[PDB]
């Protein structure tokens, strides 16, 4: 192997790959990035067992094709020190040589045949994603999901395919809030009618860095593979049954209040400077916010008077904000039954059901 590559292209590829390494243990092959030159492309792979990424850059010259491996962290360290010029990469026995002008580096390689191959799955489900809506939903629902949950299954985001109705429901929860959306008009190519994939939070956060539009999603119930022109990504799924979110969504709400998003956001930020929980008092022409000897208070006027005879509601500030960040409308709807019962937040399309404080 013998190539020249642009410093910026390489550095960038190597940054994205870091997340896919087992950096903690340099004895492992999993700490290495696998290199492969085919024609005018250097292909880079990293994988632990949970997640994996294949990526590539174009070569400025390809004098010899070949394979190699290198410690992924050390490789990035070295490349970030070099100038914005071409860098020569070249194998010599069991070493990778990195050269630029008068600077030369050597690093030891593992046998590249013992680097594990990326999985080939037989898809149980498969979709093509051209709109940004799926990844917009990931972005907005990710905050409500926690990586270290008592319940293993809640430690990711749910993808619920219903082939019959052409729907992909996306769902996140930490038990205190449940955030969800349903995408219509998805051509779902699947063996069973209903099929659920739970993507781990770690995988979810990597997907956000790498994908937006124009990619494939395939799963076989064990792995899930996402692919576009630049990347193939894989993640293991969370084994387990996500709870039936539809069964906990209240079917009816006594009240529904149309309220101003940025007004509420700003008011909640204000009271949040003193405490994380807020008392929210809805009156006919007014909404009041109070932190729960210290006090923060503030109020916003509601010109279009609410259908009320006053309604108090304890909320977590950051939860209420994260719920309102999910919305794209200028105004939002808050539906509630009793003060102690769950309440819903949605546009005037991501909805958030939230448990109040009591």
């Amino acid at each position: 192997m013998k190539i020249s590559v642009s410093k910026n292209d390489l550095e960038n590829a190597l940054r994205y790959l870091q997340a896919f390494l087992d950096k903690k243990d340099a004895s492992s092959i999993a700490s290495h990035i696998h290199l492969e030159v085919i024609k005018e492309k250097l292909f880079l792979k990293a994988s632990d067992s949970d997640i994996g990424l294949k990526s590539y850059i174009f070569t400025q010259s390809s004098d010899k094709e070949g394979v190699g491996t290198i410690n992924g962290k050390k490789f990035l360290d070295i490349i970030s020190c070099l100038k914005d010029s071409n860098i020569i990469l070249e194998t010599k026995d069991d070493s990778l040589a990195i050269k630029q002008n008068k600077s030369s580096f050597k690093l030891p390689m593992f046998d590249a045949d013992e680097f594990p191959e990326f999985p080939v799955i037989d898809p149980k489900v498969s979709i093509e994603v051209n709109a940004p809506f799926l990844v917009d939903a990931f972005k907005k629902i990710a905050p409500v999901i926690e990586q270290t949950s008592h319940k293993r299954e809640l430690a990711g985001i749910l993808m619920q395919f219903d082939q019959k109705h052409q729907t992909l429901s996306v769902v996140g929860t930490d038990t205190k809030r449940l955030s969800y959306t349903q995408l219509e008009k998805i051509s779902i190519h699947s063996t069973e009618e209903d099929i659920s994939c739970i993507l781990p939070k770690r995988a979810l956060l990597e997907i956000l860095k790498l994908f937006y539009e124009n990619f494939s999603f395939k799963s076989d119930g064990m792995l899930a593979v996402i692919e576009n022109e630049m990347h193939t990504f894989f993640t293991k799924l969370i084994d387990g049954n996500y709870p039936d979110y539809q069964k906990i969504l209240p079917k009816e709400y006594i009240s529904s209040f149309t309220l101003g998003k940025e007004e509420f956001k700003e008011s909640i930020k204000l009271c949040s400077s003193l405490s994380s929980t807020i008392k929210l008092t809805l009156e006919k022409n007014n909404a009041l916010f109070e932190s729960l000897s210290e006090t923060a208070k503030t109020s916003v006027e509601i010109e279009k008077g609410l259908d009320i005879e006053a309604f108090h509601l304890g909320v977590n500030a950051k939860f209420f904000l994260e719920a309102l960040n999910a919305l794209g409308t200028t105004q939002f709807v808050l539906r509630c039954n009793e003060p102690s019962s769950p309440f819903l937040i949605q546009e005037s399309k991501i909805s958030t059901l939230m448990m109040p404080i009591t």
């Binding site: 929860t173 038990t175 205190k176 709870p243 906990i248 102690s340 769950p342 059901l353 448990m355 404080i357």
Partner: peptide
């Protein structure tokens, strides 16, 4: 405290 939705 906050009661669990489930």
């Amino acid at each position: 405290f906050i009661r669990s939705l489930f």
